[PDB]
Amino acid sequence: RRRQLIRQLLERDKTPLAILFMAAVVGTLVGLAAVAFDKGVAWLQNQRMGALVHTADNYPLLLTVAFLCSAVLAMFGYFLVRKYAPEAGGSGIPEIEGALEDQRPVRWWRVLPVKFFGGLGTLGGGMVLGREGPTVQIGGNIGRMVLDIFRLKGDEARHTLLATGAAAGLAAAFNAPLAGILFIIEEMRPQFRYTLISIKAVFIGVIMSTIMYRIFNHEVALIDVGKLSDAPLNTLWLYLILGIIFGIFGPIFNKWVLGMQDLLHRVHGGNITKWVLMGGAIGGLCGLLGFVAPATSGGGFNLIPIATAGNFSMGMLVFIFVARVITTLLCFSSGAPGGIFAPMLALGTVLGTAFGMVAVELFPQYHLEAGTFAIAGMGALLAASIRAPLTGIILVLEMTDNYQLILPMIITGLGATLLAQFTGGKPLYSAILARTLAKQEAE
Amino acid sequence: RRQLIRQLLERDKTPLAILFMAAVVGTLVGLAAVAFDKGVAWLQNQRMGALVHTADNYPLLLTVAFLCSAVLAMFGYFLVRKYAPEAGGSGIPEIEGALEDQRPVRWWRVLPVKFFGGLGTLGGGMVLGREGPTVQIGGNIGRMVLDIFRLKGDEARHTLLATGAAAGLAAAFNAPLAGILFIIEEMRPQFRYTLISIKAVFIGVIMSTIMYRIFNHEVALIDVGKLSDAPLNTLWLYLILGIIFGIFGPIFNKWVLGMQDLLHRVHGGNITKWVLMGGAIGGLCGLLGFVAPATSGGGFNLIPIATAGNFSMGMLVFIFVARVITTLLCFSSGAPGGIFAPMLALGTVLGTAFGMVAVELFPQYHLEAGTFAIAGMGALLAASIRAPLTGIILVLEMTDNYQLILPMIITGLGATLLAQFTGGKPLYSAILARTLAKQEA
Ligand SMILES: [Br-]
Ligand SMILES: [Br-]
Ligand SMILES: [Br-]
Numbered sequence: 001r002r003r004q005l006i007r008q009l010l011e012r013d014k015t016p017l018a019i020l021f022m023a024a025v026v027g028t029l030v031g032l033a034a035v036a037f038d039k040g041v042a043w044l045q046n047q048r049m050g051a052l053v054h055t056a057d058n059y060p061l062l063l064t065v066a067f068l069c070s071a072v073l074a075m076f077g078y079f080l081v082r083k084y085a086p087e088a089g090g091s092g093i094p095e096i097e098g099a100l101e102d103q104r105p106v107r108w109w110r111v112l113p114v115k116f117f118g119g120l121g122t123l124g125g126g127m128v129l130g131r132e133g134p135t136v137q138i139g140g141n142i143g144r145m146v147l148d149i150f151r152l153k154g155d156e157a158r159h160t161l162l163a164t165g166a167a168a169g170l171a172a173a174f175n176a177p178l179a180g181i182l183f184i185i186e187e188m189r190p191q192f193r194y195t196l197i198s199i200k201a202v203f204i205g206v207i208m209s210t211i212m213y214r215i216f217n218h219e220v221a222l223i224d225v226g227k228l229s230d231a232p233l234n235t236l237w238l239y240l241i242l243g244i245i246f247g248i249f250g251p252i253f254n255k256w257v258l259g260m261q262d263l264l265h266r267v268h269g270g271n272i273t274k275w276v277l278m279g280g281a282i283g284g285l286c287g288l289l290g291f292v293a294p295a296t297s298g299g300g301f302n303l304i305p306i307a308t309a310g311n312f313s314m315g316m317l318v319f320i321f322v323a324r325v326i327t328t329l330l331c332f333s334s335g336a337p338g339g340i341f342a343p344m345l346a347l348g349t350v351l352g353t354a355f356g357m358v359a360v361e362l363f364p365q366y367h368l369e370a371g372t373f374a375i376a377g378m379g380a381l382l383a384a385s386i387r388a389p390l391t392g393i394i395l396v397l398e399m400t401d402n403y404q405l406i407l408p409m410i411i412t413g414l415g416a417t418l419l420a421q422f423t424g425g426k427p428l429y430s431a432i433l434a435r436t437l438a439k440q441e442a443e
Numbered sequence: 444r445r446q447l448i449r450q451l452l453e454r455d456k457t458p459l460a461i462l463f464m465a466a467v468v469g470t471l472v473g474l475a476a477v478a479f480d481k482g483v484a485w486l487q488n489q490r491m492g493a494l495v496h497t498a499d500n501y502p503l504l505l506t507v508a509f510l511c512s513a514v515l516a517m518f519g520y521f522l523v524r525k526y527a528p529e530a531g532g533s534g535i536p537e538i539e540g541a542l543e544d545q546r547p548v549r550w551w552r553v554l555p556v557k558f559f560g561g562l563g564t565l566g567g568g569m570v571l572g573r574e575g576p577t578v579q580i581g582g583n584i585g586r587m588v589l590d591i592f593r594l595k596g597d598e599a600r601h602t603l604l605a606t607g608a609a610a611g612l613a614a615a616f617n618a619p620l621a622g623i624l625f626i627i628e629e630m631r632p633q634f635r636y637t638l639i640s641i642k643a644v645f646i647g648v649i650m651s652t653i654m655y656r657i658f659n660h661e662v663a664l665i666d667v668g669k670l671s672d673a674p675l676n677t678l679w680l681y682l683i684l685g686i687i688f689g690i691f692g693p694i695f696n697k698w699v700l701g702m703q704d705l706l707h708r709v710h711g712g713n714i715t716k717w718v719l720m721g722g723a724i725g726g727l728c729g730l731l732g733f734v735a736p737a738t739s740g741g742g743f744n745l746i747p748i749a750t751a752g753n754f755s756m757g758m759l760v761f762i763f764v765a766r767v768i769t770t771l772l773c774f775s776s777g778a779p780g781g782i783f784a785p786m787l788a789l790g791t792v793l794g795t796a797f798g799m800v801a802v803e804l805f806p807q808y809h810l811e812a813g814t815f816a817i818a819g820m821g822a823l824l825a826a827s828i829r830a831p832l833t834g835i836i837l838v839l840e841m842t843d844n845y846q847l848i849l850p851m852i853i854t855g856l857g858a859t860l861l862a863q864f865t866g867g868k869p870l871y872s873a874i875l876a877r878t879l880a881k882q883e884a
């Protein structure tokens with residue numbers, strides 16, 4: 001095959017111009033979509049918080065519409081999915097991953113409006129869910145949409161445009177170009193066989209998407225942590241320790257979300273009315289907690305700069321972490337449209353800060369700042385649950401801009417991946433696709 | 444489909460043996476990378492110290508700077524021709540090939556050949572990088588332990604050879620990410636599925652980087668500081684720059700290939716004509732590293748000076764052309780040393796040059812030429828060797844200007860784009876093709 005290789009090596013990196021151009025329009029759309037989604041979630045959340053002012057006196061009545069408003073929006077999201085596109089429930093990343101292995105269909109005519117509006121209700125209701133779920137799945141579906149609309153033929157174009165959709169989808173969710181592209185080549189793409197996914201094209205999609213996001217969200221960081229301190233070579237060993245901790249907790253978390261999917265499936269047994277109702281309950285709880293204990297609800301981005309600064313108590317970091325574990329499970333495993341990605345950053349951040357605290361008082365000769373251990377742990381639950389640390393590490397580096405912590409971030413992350421593996425853990429996404437893929441045959 | 448379901452449930456379960464052994468590779472590659480890096484400086488120091496004791500008589504030190512770098516050069520071209528011809532030039536294509544199971548990994552030979560051989564050319568002050576030596580050595584290091592510990596399997600044979608190369612590029616730049624990204628964007632088998640463990644590659648890259656940090660910390664190779672930001676209405680300029688890189692990329696790619704031939708004529712294949720030729724190129728690199736050091740040496744030293752807009756337009760043009768010349772002579776003559784680094788220095792100067800024009804053409808953008816330098820720094824790496832992702836993440840890891848991430852991606856993309864629409868090719872793969880086609884013919 002030596003001669004084939006010589007022919008191949010010279011024909012390397014020659015992507016069809018049509019695919020490059022089509023990647024450019026996919027990105028532009030996925031961007032504007034993700035922007036519009038984000039803008040939408042904000043508006044609804046704004047009106048909700050605007051209602052708690054109209055009834056800011058009668059405290060019970062306050063605690064009433066705080067519940068109802070998030071309930072109505074949740075049900076409307078639980079409904080849109082259970083009725084028109086069941087594949088739009090949950091994250092949506094396993095489903096796109098499935099579409100890459102050619103085992104799940106990309107019914108963009110149904111998912112695009114369902115994921116967009118359904119998620120807009122759940123997210124806009126202030127449920128503990130991310131924007132990644134929608135944006136990624138929506139993005140990939142945009143990639144398929146232009147594929148059928150322009151009728152491009154080829155496995156390259158199908159796999160590529162599907163990938164640059166998800167990539168550009170993740171990019172606009174976090175203003176993180178590199179994280180999006182890296183997500184495709186480390187976790188998204190088929191993991192057991194060769195593939196014709198033009199990386200250069202995935203790049204062009206992300207670029208146009210991120211640019212679109214930059215047109216509308218200028219001069220405000222999703223997370224402004226500020227330039228923290230550094231990490232000495234004799235401090236590193238504390239990060240490997242934090243990693244191990246994440247490493248045994250990852251799989252445990254994985255079992256809970258999987259198990260909670262089952263436990264919550266009983267409550268409705270597949271019935272659309274029981275499910276929708278249960279949705280409004282979970283959503284309403286989040287809207288309630290959104291007023292009385294905001295750190296237990298919401299996406300989680302808000303409490304990240306705070307924890308990293310050490311402005312929470314050790315008691316709070318235990319409160320927030322426990323309660324958020326409970327609410328994250330409730331919102332995601334219930335099948336509501338919305339990613340688990342972002343809330344897992346919060347869990348990691350909180351747990352990291354918790355470690356950093358104890359680490360500070362135990363060893364003042366190190367001159368530690370508990371914020372360094374939070375940033376390290378930020379992308380650590382993305383290493384022991386999702387098992388895509390290279391994505392997490394780069395992502396966190398894109399959102400926090402503290403490169404001088406690249407070693408602890410890596411080391412901790414790898415502490416999580418190695419111990420997740422050894423303790424009997426499996427990637428959260430693939431472990432869900434397999435669940436979905438087995439069920440499809442089980443019946 | 445059921446095949447997939449089973450595969451999913453078993454995903455990311457790298458054998459502990461492949462893991463534990465990756466940790467030792469990176470260590471050995473790290474320590475070696477450090478020792479290599481030290482020796483090169485030590486030898487540069489001597490030539491610096493020798494120029495002192497013969498300070499007067501300008502024609503005398505023009506001679507001793509020649510000779511010292513002429514002698515060291517010959518010693519390098521010799522240790523390769525006589526003991527490991529495969530350990531000439533870069534070495535990355537060779538490891539790329541070895542990953543395809545299409546080239547041999549003679550670590551018992553290549554390791555001490557590349558090491559001391561590199562020391563002659565690197566420490567001679569020739570326009571070469573530490574990548575080639577480090578990456579290649581690293582792979583051979585990783586191969587050594589595969590042999591030494593007799594690990595059996597394609598996965599094991601592929602992983603350990605990869606992490607070694609990864610942990611070697613890293614320790615040559617203190618860039619842990621770009622090391623891991625080099626393997627999965629360029630180094631690994633580009634046309635068939637392979638069993639390389641990402642997780643395991645990581646472990647190797649760390650341990651190496653850790654070793655490097657033990658011996659080199661607190662001092663960065665390239666310091667630029669925090670440059671200004673990049674307005675959205677200014678972004679198009681980074682596309683124009685990338686386009687310029689995109690058309691020059693292949694043109695340079697031709698010359699680095701063509702000059703290989705034109706130098707192979709000079710010595711025909713003879714070890715004596717070659718070594719003696721290599722000592723002329725090397726001797727020139729020690730000489731030029733005194734009358735205009737910005738035309739010789741690795742090139743890392745002029746980058747911050749370039750970024751800060753300290754040069755003038757003329758001195759930029761001079762340095763560029765001069766370095767275009769001196770780079771080919773060092774690499775296309777098969778001297779042990781990568782071309783990765785001297786392209787960074789080429790891209791930086793070219794970028795600055797473009798930036799210099801931008802500042803005066805558009806004062807309303809309030810531009811700083813340094814931003815274009817950063818954008819264009821890893822643009823040759825994108826338009827020639829065609830690894831923009833690894834290139835960008837590298838530059839980011841060495842300049843810490845994430846605020847310029849959009850211009851850096853735009854430029855690097857417009858380079859990888861226009862290089863394809865002009866018939867350019869992955870230079871590292873264009874070399875392996877050459878070597879693989881000269882073999883079966
Ligand atoms: Br899901
Ligand atoms: Br998600
Ligand atoms: Br070479």
Ligand SMILES: [Br-]
Nearest residue numbers: 533781782783
């Ligand atoms: Br090179």
